[PDB]
Amino acid sequence: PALTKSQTDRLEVLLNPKDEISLNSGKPFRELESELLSRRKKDLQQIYAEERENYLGKLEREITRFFVDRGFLEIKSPILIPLEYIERMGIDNDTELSKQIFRVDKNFCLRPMLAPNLYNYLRKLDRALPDPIKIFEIGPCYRKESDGKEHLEEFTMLDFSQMGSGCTRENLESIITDFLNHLGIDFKIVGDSCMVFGDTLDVMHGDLELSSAVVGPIPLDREWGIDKPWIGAGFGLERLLKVKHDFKNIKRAARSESYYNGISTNL
């Protein structure tokens, strides 16, 4: 007959992009599932025998090397941050980002973004390091958005910043260009046409936003004690993974108990 929805869902979970098998012919739901199962089992086994690195962790280690080798300091800051940091980010309790905050206790939350801890480091480091100040962080970030397709509730941000001299948009577009060229991902920076400083740039791969990027100074810097030019960009690693491996669903790239390196773990 014709594959029911559960049979369709079940095969979509077992399918990978490299799979060539004819997913429409005379075979029952159930040759097809068994075939994919055998393919996905051999995929885990090959992983276990020859590689054994997690994709999310591996990409994290590769991005780290890129920025360290470019003069950027590697920051590991708290994931649990004061709720007051969200307030000085300008996310008041009527904005749309305001409703996506995982609160913990009364006073704390899971950081939805890396910027506020990075604002603080930039302020403290400016007392001890020579111009310009270049820092970056990679790590977990949380938001109650999960439209499922392009959006996770638990994801991994990269965020880098330069502060002081050299902080132009053509320098910022030159860092993003080397980064994505090193990753092997094509892009496409949209924004205002003749924007010098102050406004955001988007890094696109198709209809997929890989990053929002900022050419400071911006009025928010005063709330953080930052008084200096700066440029910076935030990238979601799961979207990057989605691009390199052609994942259909971004959940294939996330921290998970259901997928490992894009392979279903329910075999």
Ligand X SMILES: N[C@@H](Cc1ccccc1Cl)C(=O)O
232 binds, among ligand ANP, ligand X, a second copy, none (CB under 5 to 8 A by kind): ligand X
Residue 155 interacting with ligand ANP (CB under 6 A): yes
Tokens standing for 93?
Answer: 């309790």
Distance CA 44, CA 96 (A): 40
Residue 63 interacting with ligand X (CB under 6 A): no
At its nearest, how many Å lie between ligand ANP and the CB of residue 236? 3
Residue 238 interacting with ligand ANP (CB under 6 A): yes
Distance CA 78, CA 51 (A): 31
Q: Do 141 and 157 meet the contact criterion of CB atoms below 8 Å apart?
A: yes
Distance CA 148, CA 22 (A): 27
Residue 166 interacting with a second copy (CB under 8 A): no
Residue 236 interacting with ligand ANP (CB under 6 A): yes
Task: Give bridge partners of residue 81 from the DSSP assignment.
Answer: 109
State the number of binding residues for ligand X (CB under 6 A). Answer: 12
Which of 103, 149, 188, 244 is the binder for a second copy (CB under 8 A)?
Answer: 103
Which of 176, 210, 214, 215 is the binder for ligand ANP (CB under 6 A)?
Answer: 210
If residue 37 lies in a helix (H) or strand (E), which one and from where to where? helix 29-50
Distance CA 151, CA 144 (A): 9
Q: Do 79 and 111 meet the contact criterion of CB atoms below 8 Å apart?
A: yes
Q: For a second copy, what does the binding mask look like between residues 114 and 153, x meaning CB under 8 A? A: ---x--xx--xx-xxxx---------x-x----------x
Instruction: Give residue for tokens 């009364």.
Output: 106
Task: Give bridge partners of residue 110 from the DSSP assignment.
Answer: 80
Residues 6+ away with beta carbon under 8 Å from 23: 11, 15, 32
177 binds, among a second copy, ligand X, ligand ANP, none (CB under 5 to 8 A by kind): none
- Stretch of residues binding a second copy (CB under 8 A), selected from 100-108, 157-165, 194-202, 242-250: 100-108
At its nearest, how many Å lie between ligand ANP and the CB of residue 142? 9
Beta strands in the chain (DSSP E): 73-75, 80-82, 108-110, 133-142, 154-163, 189-190, 200-205, 208-215, 230-236, 259-260, 263-264
Which of 20, 94, 96, 105 is the binder for a second copy (CB under 8 A)?
Answer: 105
118 binds, among ligand ANP, a second copy, ligand X, none (CB under 5 to 8 A by kind): ligand X
Binding site for a second copy (CB under 8 A): 40-41, 44-45, 47-48, 52-54, 56-58, 61, 64, 68, 71-80, 102-105, 110, 117, 120-121, 124-125, 127-130, 140, 142, 153-154, 255-257, 260, 265-267
Binding site for ligand X (CB under 6 A): 115, 118-119, 122, 159, 161, 212, 214, 230, 232-234
